[PDB]
């Protein structure tokens, strides 16, 4: 449903692709998010310990699944169940990350 | 989850990205599928009427959701619950399609 792809070879690992679901979940337009790092979803209640775990997973290029507070464009809080996965080229060099977002609201 | 991205501007609308989930569902490696049209998943039991529906949605650049028989690399049949969505660039020109696949 909700997924993004980023390009870690570009500065600050920007989003280069986002699904319609992600746009609807976050209330941003495709135009507003392309070329930005996904961290703009974080806000006042976001646990920095979880952010650090993500940062570490990215550095190590390992898949990870975490739960963290994110915010829509209007500032609406939601729990984001976030899955991250690296993808590498045939020479083995990191090429993309993808992320799948689930809203944990009931 | 299981998803792929294709580029309809390239000859024959090849897969340019596939999730790990898609690879597990279909039993193919990323190397084996990149640069190929997804039709290699089809086979004898695949309903051609549904294939035509997909073709028309792509030609019309419209989202669609269909159900069709596919085959894994080893030849195992599965129903593919397939949702297709066009994506446009900032100028409004068709740029990609994405597809989300569910095994039932
Ligand atoms: C593919 C991908 C998707 C991501 N999706 C989210 C997300 O939905 N919400 C979020 O808070 N961070 C997301 N991130 C994490 C941030 O981009 C960034 O990695 C995180 O904030 C840790 O880095 P930092 O300490 O430099 O901010 C995603 C990262 C990647 C690579
Ligand atoms: C993004 C995307 C994903 C697709 N995924 C599948 C798939 O998983 N299985 C399948 O049988 N066809 C899939 N297709 C459809 C085929 O690639 C092709 O469009 C269809 O077979 C009709 O074209 P044809 O008559 O030339 O074969 C997908 C198409 C797109 C654009």
From Swiss-Prot, chain A:
Residue ranges constituting the PAS domain according to the UniProt record: 1-61
Annotated consequence of substituting residue 101 to K: Blue-shifted light absorption (maximum at 441 nm) and emitted fluorescence (487 nm). Red-shifted light emitted fluorescence (502 nm) but normal absorption (maximum at 447 nm)
Location relative to the cell: Cell membrane
Induction of its expression: Light fluence rate-dependent induction, independent of light quality.
Residue sites binding FMN 2 per the record: 37, 39, 42, 55, 70, 80, 82, 101
Mutation effect (residue 4 to T): Red-shifted emitted light fluorescence (502 nm) but normal absorption (maximum at 447 nm)
Biotechnology: The flavoproteins improved LOV (iLOVs) are fluorescent flavoproteins engineered from PHOT2 by improving its photostability and brighteness, and which maybe used as oxygen-independent fluorescent reporters with a small size. The iLOVs are PHOT2 fragments (385-496) and contain many amino-acid substitutions relative to cv. Columbia, to confer different properties in term of stablity, brightness and color.
Positions where S-4a-FMN cysteine occurs in the chain: 38
Record-annotated PAC domain positions: 62-106
Phenotype when the gene is knocked out: Plants lacking both PHOT1 and PHOT2 have curled downward leaves missing color changes and lower petiole angles in response to weak or strong blue light (BL). Impaired proton H(+) pumping associated with altered increased ATP hydrolysis and absence of binding between 14-3-3 protein and H(+)-ATPase (e.g. AHA1 and AHA2) in response to BL in guard cells of plants missing PHOT1 and PHOT2.
Record's function text: Protein kinase that acts as a blue light photoreceptor in a signal-transduction pathway for photo-induced movements. Triggers the phosphorylation of AHA1 and AHA2 C-terminal penultimate Thr in guard cells to activate them and induce stomatal opening in response to blue light (BL). Also phosphorylates BLUS1, a kinase involved in stomatal opening. Mediates calcium spiking of extra- and intracellular origins in response to blue light. Involved in hypocotyl phototropism.
Subunit structure: Homodimer. Interacts with PKS1, PKS2, RPT3 and PHOT1. Associates with CBC1 and CBC2. Binds to BHP.
Record text about domains: The activation loop within the kinase domain is the target of phosphorylation. The PAS (PER-ARNT-SIM) domains are required for the binding of FMN chromophores.
Protein name per its UniProtKB record: Phototropin-2
Native source organism of the sequence: Arabidopsis thaliana
Lineage, highest ranks first: Eukaryota, Viridiplantae, Streptophyta, Embryophyta, Tracheophyta
């Amino acid at each position: 449903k909700n997924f993004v792809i980023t390009d870690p070879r570009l500065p600050d690992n920007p989003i280069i692709f986002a699904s319609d679901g992600f746009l609807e979940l976050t209330e941003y337009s495709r135009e507003e998010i392309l070329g930005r790092n996904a961290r703009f979803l974080q806000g006042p209640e976001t646990d920095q310990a979880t952010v650090q775990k993500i940062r570490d997973a990215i550095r190590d290029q390992r898949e990870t699944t975490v739960q963290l507070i994110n915010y829509t464009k209007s500032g609406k809080k939601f729990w984001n169940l976030l899955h991250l996965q690296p993808v590498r080229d045939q020479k083995g060099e990191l090429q993309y990350f993808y992320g799948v977002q689930l809203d944990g609201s009931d």
